[PDB]
Amino acid sequence: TTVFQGVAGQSLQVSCPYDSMKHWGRRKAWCRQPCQRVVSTHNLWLLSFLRRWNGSTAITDDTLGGTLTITLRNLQPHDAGLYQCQSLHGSEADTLRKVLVEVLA
Amino acid sequence: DTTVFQGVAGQSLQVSCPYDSMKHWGRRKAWCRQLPCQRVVSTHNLWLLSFLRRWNGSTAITDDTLGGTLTITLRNLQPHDAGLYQCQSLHGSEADTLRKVLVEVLA
Amino acid sequence: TTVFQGVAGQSLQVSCPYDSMKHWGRRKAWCRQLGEKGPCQRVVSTHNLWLLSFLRRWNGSTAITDDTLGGTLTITLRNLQPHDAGLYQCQSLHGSEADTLRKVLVEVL
Amino acid sequence: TTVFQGVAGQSLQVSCPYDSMKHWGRRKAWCRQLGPCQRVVSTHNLWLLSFLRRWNGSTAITDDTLGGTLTITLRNLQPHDAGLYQCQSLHGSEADTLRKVLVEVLA
Amino acid sequence: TTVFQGVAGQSLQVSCPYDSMKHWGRRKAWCRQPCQRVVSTHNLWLLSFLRRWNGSTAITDDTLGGTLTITLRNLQPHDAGLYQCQSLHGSEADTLRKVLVEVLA
Amino acid sequence: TTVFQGVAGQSLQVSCPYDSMKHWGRRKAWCRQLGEKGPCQRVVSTHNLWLLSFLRRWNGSTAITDDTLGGTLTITLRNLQPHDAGLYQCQSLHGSEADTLRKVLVEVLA
Ligand SMILES: *[C@@H]1O[C@H](CO)[C@@H](O)[C@H](O)[C@H]1NC(C)=O
Ligand SMILES: *[C@@H]1O[C@H](CO)[C@@H](O)[C@H](O)[C@H]1NC(C)=O
Ligand SMILES: *[C@@H]1O[C@H](CO)[C@@H](O)[C@H](O)[C@H]1NC(C)=O
Ligand SMILES: *[C@@H]1O[C@H](CO)[C@@H](O)[C@H](O)[C@H]1NC(C)=O
Ligand SMILES: *[C@@H]1O[C@H](CO)[C@@H](O)[C@H](O)[C@H]1NC(C)=O
Ligand SMILES: *[C@@H]1O[C@H](CO)[C@@H](O)[C@H](O)[C@H]1NC(C)=O
């Protein structure tokens, strides 16, 4: 597990490394813990660089470097908890990283 | 603060400007001189080709939007090129400053 | 050891030459070494496909490109800060071993 | 005749500006004074691919023909690399000196 | 109306900037003041970088950076006058810039 | 003819520059010359697919690779031994023929 803390009201940047060759062709998803799915990368894998949003949560993927980037805009106290980066393939979903987010003031 | 770059006259000077790639996602960049900030060069009008080097006179510019770095080349640097400049990020008709740069020329 | 020094807040370019024939076909890595035979932690490596070594790979604020014809490995430390100073290794990968191409001290002015 | 100073064991970049319209369509070369100037590297035989890096030994050359900048890279600079060199613009069978360069190796 | 001044018997380089995306696909012309056409860029717009000559006048176009370059080789007093850079579209021609060429001994 | 000397037991690198435009599309070969314009015993040649000329090709402890853009052929003699010494040709191949790019004397030192 990894912990990311950010000041309230600002953007928090969560980085998620993976093996770019192992997960080649797979979309990624950001979910919160069951595991409520928040956002996934674009349906067209060659457009994984595209920033996609759910509310004030953005996801973007560098598939050459193997870096998945989740952005949390306007970090509120409610946004603390436990989340997962996952790699989707068919119906299954391997966890890439489990992430705990903290807020400060 | 304002970064200082030093180059020898008659040689090429590479000025770099880091920025946050998420904050400025999708935004073109520009390079201008202070006299007001007079525009010198901007990156490609199509953001997905920001890596393509654009020239204006002896100044070139390229953008690496994934790494979050803007690179400006001052070709054949001359003492009259010394002065104050700005890396900017454009959206709508506003120009957010990313870095103030001071260019010094030597012997 | 070779010393590279740069101004803080500006990009620093580090180049490691190597024998292109001895390390033909090998991927490269840049790593940070904290002990004479210390952990030596991976920072960034070249493309998983060796014929695409020339493509810039980013990890964080570090970029790597390899010129396998000239035998020159180029590392870019973007926005150099004091915490970047220290000892690093250019390494050539084969199997699960890494051979040292060059030891590099990064100093920050 | 400009002086380019480089640290030994590191790659030294020599940059060489030229009038891009007066040398249009022309190949460029790097040579070392010995005395006659002996040819080291030249740019791509096809002028429209001059941007493509060409190596001879520990010397590389690339040409940006739009901006009018020629770049030479001395790889792994050694003490025996110091000396006088020349950027040349080729046309027919004559070579015009674009820039005389003194290379200085430090330590 | 910008002024360009060049010593007689030597090359004068006249540069006209323009908006590259606005003029995408359009060829350019150099005209002398009606407006008598002197030289225009290549018929194949993807070869606009090609230097075209009319006598001692040459024209070349950088469609990526949006810079048109006119060269008056071996400038002579009878080349002084008022000129125009133009963008050709369909059958019309829009003035990019008006250029005053001046010569010195 | 130029001499390339190496110490016995270590890799020796031979270089053959050539006019990359003149020899565009031609494979290259390293062969041992045993007579006055006579037998050229072929040792190793670059890849049969010319766009793959960068590929390292082996015969025993001898390797060849070709930089067709810069115009440089590289022969590697790994673990140089006395039986490697001799007169060699760098060749440019076309049809059934061969143009001599360079003549090389390989010498071994203990
Ligand atoms: C956005 O996140 C909420 C939070 O659970 C979820 O209910 C909703 O379905 C998401 N939107 C989309 C389009 O998936
Ligand atoms: C180049 O500079 C001129 C004036 O300095 C300006 O009119 C032109 O639009 C510029 N071009 C670019 C691509 O910035
Ligand atoms: C980037 O760094 C992280 C740890 O900081 C590591 O997990 C990942 O493998 C690295 N990426 C590459 C391509 O080396
Ligand atoms: C490289 O330079 C050397 C002189 O230092 C020369 O003999 C050789 O021919 C050059 N290479 C090419 C491909 O011309
Ligand atoms: C340019 O060419 C046109 C016809 O293409 C001709 O009428 C004109 O005289 C020429 N101008 C010069 C300066 O040669
Ligand atoms: C290796 O070279 C010898 C001559 O030295 C030759 O007879 C043999 O056929 C070569 N083998 C291959 C696989 O090319």
UniProtKB/Swiss-Prot annotation, chain B:
Effect of residue 29 to M: Loss of LDL, CLU and APOE binding
Record annotation: effect of changing residue 107 to S: No effect on protein expression and maturation
Location of the Ig-like V-type domain: 10-89
Annotated effect of mutating residue 103 to G: In PLOSL2; results in defective protein maturation; increases protein aggregation; decreases cell membrane localization
Mutagenesis / variant outcome for changing residue 19 to C: Results in defective protein maturation and trafficking; loss of proteolytic cleavage by ADAM10 and ectodomain shedding; increases protein aggregation; decreases cell membrane localization; decreased phagocytosis; loss of LDL, CLU and APOE binding; greatly decreases LDL and CLU uptake into cells
PTM comment: Undergoes ectodomain shedding through proteolytic cleavage by ADAM10 and ADAM17 to produce a transmembrane segment, the TREM2 C-terminal fragment (TREM2-CTF), which is subsequently cleaved by gamma-secretase.
Extracellular side: 1-107
Function: Forms a receptor signaling complex with TYROBP which mediates signaling and cell activation following ligand binding. Acts as a receptor for amyloid-beta protein 42, a cleavage product of the amyloid-beta precursor protein APP, and mediates its uptake and degradation by microglia. Binding to amyloid-beta 42 mediates microglial activation, proliferation, migration, apoptosis and expression of pro-inflammatory cytokines, such as IL6R and CCL3, and the anti-inflammatory cytokine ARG1.
Protein name: Triggering receptor expressed on myeloid cells 2
Organism taxonomic ancestry: Eukaryota, Metazoa, Chordata, Craniata, Vertebrata
Gene name linked to the record: TREM2
